[PDB]
């Protein structure tokens, strides 16, 4: 019933990025520069196919530093992970939700079975609970 740490996710396909700055409603706790990654199974779902069990999406969140009209990546704050298992994660729409503090496998963050994560993602039911869109 646990989401696997997504070993090697830094080698995966870069889906998209966004910056959430102070003053944005999601400033706590999603503030910073985030990169979304997708393994091969997740790419099948993102392209408009279906998500196979074993699809993984990673939200990779960096702190940033203000450097002379540049925002520069600082320390990693955390990763968010969605792992596809239609049966095992059926309580949260077939995705298991987990967070890892500083992206460390030993700092698991989710305490409520991912119901809190799923509460927000449920708005995206029509895109299989995934916000991110594939871009060129």
Contact residues for a copy of itself, defined by CB under 8 A: 10-11, 13-14, 16-27, 33, 35, 37, 64, 68-73, 76, 103, 135-136
Contacts of range 29-36, beta carbons closer than 8 Å, 24 or more positions apart: 29/77, 29/78, 30/61, 31/77, 32/61, 32/62, 32/63, 32/64, 32/74, 32/77, 33/61, 33/62, 33/64, 33/71, 33/73, 34/59, 34/60, 34/61, 34/62, 35/59, 35/60, 35/62, 36/60, 36/132
Has 27 been labeled as part of a binding site? yes
Window 15-34: residues binding ligand HEC (CB under 6 A): 16, 18, 34
Using a 10 angstrom Cβ sphere, with 0-12 exposed, 13-18 middle and 19 or more buried, the burial of residue 15 is buried
Has 24 been labeled as part of a binding site? no
Has 34 been labeled as part of a binding site? yes
Is 82 a binding residue for ligand HEC by CB under 6 A? The answer is yes
| Part in contact with ligand HEC (CB under 6 A); list of ranges 6-14, 61-69, 91-99, 100-108 | 91-99
With beta carbons less than 8 A apart as the criterion, state whether 3 and 83 touch: yes
8 or 23: CB nearest Zn ion? 23
Has 11 been labeled as part of a binding site? no
20 makes contact, choosing from ligand HEC, a copy of itself, Zn ion, none, with CB < 5 to 8 Å by partner type, with a copy of itself
26 or 122: CB nearest a copy of itself? 26
Is 132 a binding residue for ligand HEC by CB under 6 A? The answer is yes
């Amino acid at each position: 019933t646990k989401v696997k740490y997504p070993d090697g996710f830094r080698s995966w396909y870069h889906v998209k990025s966004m910056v959430i700055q102070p003053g944005h409603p999601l400033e706590n706790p999603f503030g910073g520069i985030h990169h979304v990654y997708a393994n091969a199974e997740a790419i099948q779902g993102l392209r408009g196919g279906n998500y196979p069990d074993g699809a993984v999406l990673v939200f990779d969140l960096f702190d940033y530093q203000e450097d002379n009209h540049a925002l520069v990546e600082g320390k990693r704050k955390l990763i968010g992970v969605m792992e596809r298992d239609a049966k095992r994660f059926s309580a949260t729409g077939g995705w298991g939700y987990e967070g890892f503090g500083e992206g460390k496998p030993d700092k698991r963050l989710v305490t409520d079975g991912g119901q809190g994560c799923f509460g927000c993602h449920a708005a995206q039911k029509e895109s299989q609970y995934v916000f991110s869109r594939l871009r060129d």
